Inverse folding.
């Protein structure tokens, strides 16, 4: 990779070989195609899974859901044309994207019909059938999470990633609990580190020790960050990782901070989350030894919009840990209201 | 931090934000032009060290030796302006750069007055004395190894919009055994990892497993690579690292290969070394259980230049491991000749 | 302009000073956001334009239309506060954007600012009223072209945008048929040339002569390209400008190719367009003197998706001219099917 | 290509792809070592030229003269060993270089490469052959302009050079009065224009109209600027070109200014000029209709260093034109002294 950079603290400039890591979270990437292997093979796999009793799918990330939405209609058309009666219906992703115990089997043979749908870009109708292969969506009662598949697709190549911008996939053969390595990038240079993938951008710094600086999450996954793509992965205890290991947080020393423990019960139901170590607007935080213990994260403002003004923490170190979302400004587990009834506090919905 | 990018494998052009890592190994010639912070205080420290029994400084990296060689004149003048009797003699760098029990003291106060040094750094006139604060060189007899100082210099700032960017060093405050963190860059992106600093460039890739691909060594240090700049340092035994831990090799799973132990007795005396996994030119290797055991490495050609074309090893995996040096191609420790007297084989020099 | 680059024909690096022109059409992230300098001045001007008989204004460029979309709410709210009966409603893009006889007159005064208008924008669009300053849209029946403004804006200044350069505008004073020069950029570096603005990119090259090499269009203006920013204007015949002078094509010898002429009946209805000189999969052209005459472009495939493979050209040169739109390949006005019914050909309506 | 930029005019740091044109004259960063692509073939060319009767060659560009002096020894070493009596002597360039009425003969076949001539360079010379093939210099008496070769070479290609690219050359089989178009570069960006090559750097901008701004000439060619690299060719009259078309002034409206005619009697005998528009040090020009006629350029200081302070111009414009050479400032044709004897004035020379 031949490329350049322009420093912002200073203004030095230089171009030359190396390794370049790009922030695709705030950039919002671009339009993509997401060719899930051979649409015929995907149709055969979904039919075979339906035979076994796999009633639906829960997207692991926000690219798989978009791929399913894109190929919905054309998969339905392929199914109708063949001697198969099954409808694929998709929906909206609800965070956090929970786990599933099933995997889509790889078909032994392709369906016996013409393969004119390679790259099918939707734009086709089909007849509705009673039995449906629900994907994501609010079809919880219809298809319980028990019989739902999860993490079955494996990125293969990035053919024509400059202008076409297509990410090709294929159904994986072996069981795994691991996130996709192909879209992960980690880097450290001097006193700045950054772990990231298509939806996570974590930043760490050095101040007498390596610690967490800032994080921007546009989704809440549940896979496991691979160890081969994380820095300093020895002697680390899981009780100190700010982003729990159950939400795809690196198992690393850069993933911690002094005075804080695992944030397992935060506002993980939001759509966009930014972790900033700074006081919530209009509120003050102090360290007192009489403050309460750790519990669910609470929002700064009440239901009617009134702002709370005094907060306390037991052992946290300023500046505090606060989550920023479209709903408002939240606070960490260690930070509790100084004096306020629990009625007006909007606890986060527990994530189990 | 915005930067260029063009990958020739995919011809993809990108422009974004993040962390950009560069290969600064070729530019070892003239990467910098500077002097340590306030060479007046450096002269004070040198004198105080001389009073306490520090007769020499064995450099740890080629950058440090170059700094000493480029500041010799000004430091000598500052010594021969107050009344100090000390001669700084800077020799050549002998690989591998070895260790020093002692450390350079931090002075309490500067010298009484050295303003003449201001504005007079390169073209400075002084005289010679009897006392010799030798810096490396071929002076083991004069100042033995046990009385030298080693790895007592840090970095504060570096890089500028110029061909030679000033680097402001500083005397270390406390004991330490690790290489300089400020000049290390690690990065993994998909199936390509890169560990690197100003003299090392180690490359790894995934082929059904994370392995070692290639390594370029312009020096042979003896510090210890910091773990905070290492990928996947969990559950790794030090007997499998290809580049030993005693020659500042990363303690990671990316720093090994299957069928090869640690290479303690390689050709660590060369000026420039490249580690490659490919058959040594003109020769061939076979996998046989009746070949020789582990020991010092051997050169492909004899003293007169005769090419040895037959080699064997017990349990290695092809392609073999060969060290490429200015002298020539050298084989791995586990690879031995099938039919050749040990008198005709050049044994590598091992320094412990 | 302090900066630098990497030449990828020879793979060389060099940092210095000069003039730098960038390819702003194929940009990963947006850098320019049209805005109005004085929304009060714009609102007064809009009211007066309606009073003298302008029912709407056709956007000249997509980015001006985006600005109109953004301002719609604030303009409606502020007009309603004072009591003005005007209701700005913006339609969707239709290509090309036809020129209008009228010009937005410069307002005599400035519209007053309401107390609640501070910060009220992007969501305060007002109800439809008798006076409706429609903008763009495929609704010319409501607003005839003869009573539509066109190109009444100027680049007052280039505001500083760290992430997105904000460009503020003021109502034009001079009636001109010329594009905005504040965003134009032309260059020749030996044999490579480039004409560009916000939405155009016309590459050119040298092979025994100066000929068109490629292009890219994300809109379809109707301005006239200034000669001050054109290379080799003199001596050109308008009948040979590939991109017609009516659609803002440069008047130069760089805007031409041998064997072709003005393409005025091309796929100018497409939303985006890549003019490329080569055949695309599933076709073939043979230079034959008996082929058909010059007529509107015909897509390679049929309405049912069947591809015509035999093509003939009268006096063309290989490779041919094919426009890559969002639907698929097309072939220039000099390229006709060898043998195919006219019914199965998707002709493109001439834009005039 | 992808490029750096930290422009300090607007402090807008930008990156992207496009065309980058670098200043090379004002910075004197002539980082190109001119060489012949086939220095061996040139011996046959000079021999054939001498057979016809070309007594000498006058350089068209300072870099051609640099090449000639660099290859003087290369040619002289071989010429003695092929039974050829011809010695090339390269002098100094006398600005402004003149237009010669012939070119070198086209080579017939390759001249054999001698064994001992190989490796001989400008450190070894021929021993005073009877006929001397002079290059440049004040040898007009020895060989007049009437038999001088002029502009017979063209840049063949660009060699690879980290710090100094080796420009390659080849003989032209044609008669063209045009400058080397493979080292030219032109560009307009918003309001910023620049016509450039190895030795010229003309600058232009807009203030109510496109007018010349400044220039920097480190030589005085006599080639004609091609119009394929000029902005706004059409409509220009040669009589208005500030820098004469005979001294390689671009044919455009950026090459001209209002209130000035062509300056064909300027200080064209200098060694380097900086044309600029501002009053000479401590002088004053008045606008009076009774001033003198157009005439040579008169320096501000007389032969003894006395300054003239009162100047006039009839159809004048301000700030005035004044070319700054290494001897001092001069005033344009239209600017004449109000009251001063003609004997104390300095008059330039026209190299028709
Ligand atoms: C961070 O480090 C700097 C020096 O690098 C130190 O002065 C500062 O106190 C540290 N902490 C904060 C919160 O800035
Ligand atoms: C892995 O290595 C083997 C042997 O070196 C080679 O044949 C193969 O192409 C490599 N690549 C992969 C993806 O396994």
């Amino acid at each position: 990779d031949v490329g350049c950079s322009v420093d912002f603290s200073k203004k030095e400039t230089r171009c030359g070989t190396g390794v370049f890591i790009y922030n695709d979270v705030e950039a919002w990437r671009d339009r993509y195609k997401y060719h899930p292997d051979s649409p015929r093979r995907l149709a055969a796999a979904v039919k075979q899974a339906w035979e076994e009793g796999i009633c639906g799918i829960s997207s692991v990330s926000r690219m798989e859901n978009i791929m399913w939405k894109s190929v919905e209609g054309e998969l339905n058309a392929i199914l109708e044309e063949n001697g198969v009666q099954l409808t694929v219906v998709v929906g909206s992703v609800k965070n956090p994207m929970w786990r599933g115990p099933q995997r889509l089997p790889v078909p032994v043979n392709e369906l016996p019909h013409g393969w004119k749908a390679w790259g099918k870009s939707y734009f086709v109708r089909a007849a509705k059938t009673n039995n449906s292969f629900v994907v994501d969506g609010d079809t919880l009662k219809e298809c319980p999470l028990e019989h739902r598949a999860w993490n079955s697709f494996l990125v293969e190549d990035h053919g024509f990633g400059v202008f076409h911008t297509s990410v090709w996939l294929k159904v994986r053969e072996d069981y795994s609990l691991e996130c996709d390595p192909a879209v992960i990038g980690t880097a450290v240079k001097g006193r700045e580190a950054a772990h990231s993938d298509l939806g996570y951008w974590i930043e760490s710094e050095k101040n007498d020790t390596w610690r967490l600086k800032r994080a921007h999450l546009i989704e809440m996954k549940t896979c496991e960050w691979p160890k081969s793509h994380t820095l300093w992965t020895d002697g680390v205890e899981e009780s100190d990782l700010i982003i729990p290991k159950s939400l795809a947080g690196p198992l690393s020393h850069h993933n911690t901070r002094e005075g804080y423990r695992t944030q397992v019960k935060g506002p993980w139901h939001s759509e966009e989350l930014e972790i900033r170590f700074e006081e919530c607007p209009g509120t003050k935080v102090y360290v007192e030894e009489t403050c309460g213990t750790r519990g669910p994260s609470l929002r700064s403002t009440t239901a009617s919009g009134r702002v709370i003004e005094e907060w306390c923490c037991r052992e946290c170190t300023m500046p505090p840990l606060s989550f920023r979302a479209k709903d408002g400004c939240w606070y960490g587990m260690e930070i509790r209201p100084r004096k306020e009834p629990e009625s007006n506090l909007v606890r986060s919905m527990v994530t189990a």
Q: What stands out?
A: Chain C touches chain D through 53 residues (CB under 8 Å). Helices of chain C lie at 39-51, 62-82.
